[PDB]
Design a protein around this ligand. Sequence first.
Ligand SMILES: Nc1ncnc2c1ncn2[C@@H]1O[C@H](COP(=O)(O)OP(=O)(O)OP(=O)(O)O)[C@@H](O)[C@H]1O
Lengths: 102, 107
Amino acid sequence: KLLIIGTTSRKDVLQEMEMLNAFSTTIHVPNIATGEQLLEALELLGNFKDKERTTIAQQVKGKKVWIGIKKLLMLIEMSLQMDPEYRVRKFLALLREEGASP
Amino acid sequence: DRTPLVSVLLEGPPHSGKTALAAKIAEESNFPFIKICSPDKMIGFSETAKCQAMKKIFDDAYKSQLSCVVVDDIERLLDYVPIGPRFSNLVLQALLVLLKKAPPQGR
Ligand SMILES: Nc1ncnc2c1ncn2[C@@H]1O[C@H](COP(=O)(O)OP(=O)(O)OP(=O)(O)O)[C@@H](O)[C@H]1O
């Protein structure tokens, strides 16, 4: 008995090559798309503390988001290098600039 | 006796079970000689290797008195792909030639 798993990031191209017929099924992996999910992720990672978390909540809780986890880690790391009293603003600026384009 | 060579094509949509039926028909023939030329025994071969393998199989078939041979998944045997399109001209020419060659008399 043998099992094969395969990963990709552009389904359509494979569709054109007549390759989706070979596989037996498909599974979809989504992004983060709500403020609650983002806040939960931050809390699990624990990078930002209570007051900063509240500020971020007020800033973001009333909108929608489109980002990937592997990008989120890098954004946090980039943000952390500033001074203690500028981190939140730079993080928010980066998150705004990344752009959603769902 | 006037037509020593005969050919037939099995066609259908995907996942229809063509290979199974072809194999069953070949088995019921009860001929002395039977052979199947599948593409999965030649993974990674270049064009010339494929040509030579097919030629060898067909010669072995020629040797005997009456024979039956199976060729399955033609579109894979010559590498086809919609984009382009692309494929191996050499194998196509080989098949087109072989389909119109009669064996030695009385066979
Ligand atoms: N009535 C039937 N006719 C043919 N095959 C059948 C039938 N019932 C069950 N089978 C089984 O179904 C399978 C036939 O699948 P097969 O791979 O031959 O199809 P295929 O069209 O060649 O597929 P593909 O297009 O992916 O190459 C075999 O396991 C065969 O024994």
